């Protein structure tokens, strides 16, 4: 689900990505039809530019943190960092080093809360390059004739089944994370040339690559499936199967 | 009623700092200076716009119509223009 959403009706999956050059916000939200001069309000009220920045930039930003608040309720953010801040806050009047060591764990918490509440963005260009290389899909779909009907991609809550992913039964990792960092979603596609539709389901997880400490790909499609439907033909394509992928690569278990 | 409104006092400002009375003098000068400089910059784009839109076209290139030139030709034509077109049409396309 898209966390950053205003009352604007168009381009919901790009609202957080698009960086507009407006000095302020437009008077009205993007019109879905031609309206009348009396449908809109001339010379909008005083302090309108500030009101818009709050309801179009601030408020949808807080709705994102509230929508994904279950990913920041870890013992490290809840108890450790606030407790570390209070220990040095009692000596804040003795020196400046105590003010710093008391505010640092708060800035660290904001950074983890900031990155964990963002909408999960996979490398969509890697994805389209993967499906357009399959011949069974290029038979009915092409980038010049494809259109999106629906999009869903959200993190999975809590720890998963402790037989398919035993990695997350680690008390040290659980101290920093309450979620899995994995995401699941789908893509409703359509081709206006062939008249075909397909649901591109996918599951992602972070994996390590070529290095010791850094993550290689935070959103690696370990399960990628396409249920194609045409005039009278139904096909099921498997670009990436989880039974064969989970035997080669395992998740990353982010810390901090 | 709060004490924050005491900042409005200027009768007894010499009892605390006596600084407001001299700082604003600079602020007024700074505004006057920026008024002269900025007005000169933003106003003096017109000589370049006037010359280029009247002398920059050439025959080895295509001059494309602008928004204003579209509205004027279609919705700001005078009577003589309306008469000339219909005068050419009737004589050549109708009456040969």
């Amino acid at each position: 689900q898209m966390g950053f959403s205003s009352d604007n009706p168009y381009n919901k999956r790009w609202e957080y990505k698009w960086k507009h050059s407006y000095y302020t916000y437009p008077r009205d939200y993007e019109h879905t039809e031609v309206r009348k001069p009396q449908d809109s309000k001339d010379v909008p009220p005083i302090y309108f530019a500030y009101y818009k920045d709050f309801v179009d930039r601030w408020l949808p930003g807080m709705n994102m943190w509230w929508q994904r608040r279950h990913r920041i309720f870890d013992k490290f953010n809840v108890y450790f960092l606030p407790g570390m801040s209070l220990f040095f806050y009692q000596f804040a009047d003795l020196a400046l080093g105590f003010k710093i060591m008391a505010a640092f764990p708060l800035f660290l918490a904001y950074t983890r809360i900031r990155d964990k509440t963002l909408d999960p963005d996979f490398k969509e260009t890697y994805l389209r390059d993967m499906i357009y290389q399959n011949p069974e899909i290029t038979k009915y779909f092409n980038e010049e004739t494809i259109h999106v009907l629906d999009y869903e991609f959200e993190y999975l809550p809590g720890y998963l089944c402790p037989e398919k992913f035993p990695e997350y039964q680690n008390k040290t990792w659980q101290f920093f994370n309450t979620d899995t960092a994995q995401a699941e979603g789908f893509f409703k596609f359509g081709d206006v040339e062939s008249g075909a539709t397909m649901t591109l389901k996918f599951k992602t997880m972070p994996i390590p690559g070529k290095f010791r400490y850094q993550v290689g790909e935070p959103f690696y499609f370990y399960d990628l499936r396409a249920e194609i439907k045409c005039d009278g033909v139904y096909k099921e394509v498997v670009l990436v199967d989880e039974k064969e992928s989970l035997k080669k690569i395992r998740p990353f278990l982010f810390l901090i | 009623i709060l004490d924050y409104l005491f900042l409005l006092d200027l009768n007894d400002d010499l009892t605390r700092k006596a600084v407001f009375e001299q700082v604003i003098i600079f602020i007024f000068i700074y505004c006057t200076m920026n008024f002269l400089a900025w007005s000169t910059v933003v106003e003096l784009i017109w000589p370049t716009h006037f010359f280029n839109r009247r002398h920059s076209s050439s025959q080895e290139f295509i001059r494309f119509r602008t928004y204003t030139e579209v509205l004027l030709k279609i919705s700001a034509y005078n009577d003589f223009f309306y008469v000339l077109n219909n005068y050419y049409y009737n004589q050549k396309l109708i009456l040969k």
Partner: protein
Amino acid sequence: GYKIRNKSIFWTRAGWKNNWHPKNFNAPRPSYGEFTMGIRCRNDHHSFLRYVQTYRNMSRHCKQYFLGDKQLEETFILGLRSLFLVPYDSQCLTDQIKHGGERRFVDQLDRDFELISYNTHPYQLFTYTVRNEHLAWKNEQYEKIQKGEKTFEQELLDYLDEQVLAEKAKLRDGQNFSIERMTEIALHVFRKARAGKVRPAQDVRGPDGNVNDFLEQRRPFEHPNPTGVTH
């Protein structure tokens, strides 16, 4: 009449007539993954769709104040396209601009739309003024036609059709009534009609046919020179 004589007028340190990538010291340089730790860049691949939605908005938000005038909606579209087609038809190589011409133009159109959303863009106010003056002239014609009266535009067309007959009835040696000849006849009438507006036709003399109008005149007692002294 007068041509630029300097042959190096269009020379720049970046080449001839180069207004897309002027030469500067801090020039763009490549980046290598294996050696790059972090980067701060604002460039993205969202300019295409922003170029599409910006058009849809500027068009739909301008039509709110056209009052269903179909001829104005179609005229405005032609003008809106002339504004979006600048990068595709310009001499400037917009694909070679310094840091991406696509992002540059899209961000520029967004500033125009912001003013359009408030109905404060000078193109909008100019369209309203131009259109109102046009309809006032069209309604004047309608009111004169409903009364069976003749419009000043139709009187010219009829006066020009008969002059063509008079000029071609004597053009027997040749039979090519060129568009050049048709033109000078109409312009000669226009110049006399143009001068007639300020000095109407009182008698058979015609429009602006009185010499006495050009004798010494004086301002009326009720409207003297308000701006300066007279003596």
